[PDB]
Amino acid sequence: SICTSEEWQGLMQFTLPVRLCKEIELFHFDIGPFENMWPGIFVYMVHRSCGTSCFELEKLCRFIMSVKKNYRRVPYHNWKHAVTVAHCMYAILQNNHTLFTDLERKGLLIACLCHDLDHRGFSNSYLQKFDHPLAALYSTSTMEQHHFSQTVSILQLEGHNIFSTLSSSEYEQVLEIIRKAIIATDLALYFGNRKQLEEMYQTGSLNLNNQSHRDRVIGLMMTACDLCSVTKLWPVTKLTANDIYAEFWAEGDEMKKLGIQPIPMMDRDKKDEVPQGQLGFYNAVAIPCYTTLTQILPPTEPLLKACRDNLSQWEKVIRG
Ligand SMILES: Cc1ccc([C@H]2C[C@@H]2COc2cc(NCc3nnc(C)s3)nc(C)n2)nc1
Ligand SMILES: [Mg+2]
Ligand SMILES: [Zn+2]
Secondary structure (H helix, E strand, O other), X not given: OOOXXXXXXXXXXXXXXXXXXXXXXXXXXXXXHHHHHHXXXXXXXXXXXXXXXXXXXXXXXXXXXXXXOOOOOOOOOOHHHHHHHHHHHHHHHHOOHHHOOHHHHHHHHHHHHHOOOOOOOOOHHHHHHOOOHHHHHOOOOHHHHHHHHHHHHHHOOOOOXXXXXXXXXXXXXXXXXXXXXXXOOOHHHHHHHXXXXXXXHHHOOOOOOOHHHHHHHHHHHHHHHHOHHHHOOHHHHHHHHHHHHHHHHHHHHHHHHOOOOOOHHHOHHHHHHHHHHHHHHHHHHHHHHHHHHHHXXXXXXXXXXXXXXXXXXXXXXXXX
């Protein structure tokens, strides 16, 4: 789908309220209440991370409005999820600016905006177990490969390629930065990645100059951004969780119509077990992630602090 003439023109003429400028720098920033400003917020973030001449303003505004039109109206993995994940990446980048190159900053902001592109509200297991065409095309990381394929297709639209002004080597480097960042958002790969990084940090062998290490660090940054709803203020973290489960329970509903027993996280009859399962996700997934990200990039400590606050909140729910 391509953005209409009206859409990209509209955000070229957008102006961000100076009250927001101070707020958007904080890790806990919730975008939720500013729906009309989401595309323009992405523009400001790109222009503050990689400068006013980062990309052609027309091309960038067309790209952004076409990415919005290709996210589906599903409960969680929607346009709103994309800007939230891109905002968290901007906050990480701003706080560690000279650790990343211009090309990495450009790639990661665009990778986050496009990372769940064209999501059907179905997990990789649903598509693989029910022999969906996408699973025959992509054996592993099924949706994550499709999201990359879709990202490349928006760049192949008339006047959308924000990267063509890069040298041929810079272009292939950015397209590989994006492919790897998007694949790292498949939570199945996260556990292995975090284990290796924890190992390299403890032993003292982690070296950001080593491209293999750099790729794993970027991957952990993408996970942290993907799950950042656990780093928001408790009321926000709570309302987002209702959206996550609205999408998980809708997948389990499709399995129940096909005579299939879903796991408890995708079963709406198992709502009571959500506080306990959220506690488990914080203990095994969220806390380790932000703990390792803070060890590597100490300015990202507020993410570990906020995640720890919501862990204490989920424990409070469980206790009564
Ligand atoms: C009964 C029971 C058992 C276990 C669980 C917990 C594992 C789930 C909690 O999963 C998540 C996933 C997630 N982000 C990735 C996503 N993938 N697809 C989406 C849709 S959200 N972010 C958060 C805050 N929580 N819940 C209930
Ligand atoms: Mg995803
Ligand atoms: Zn995501």
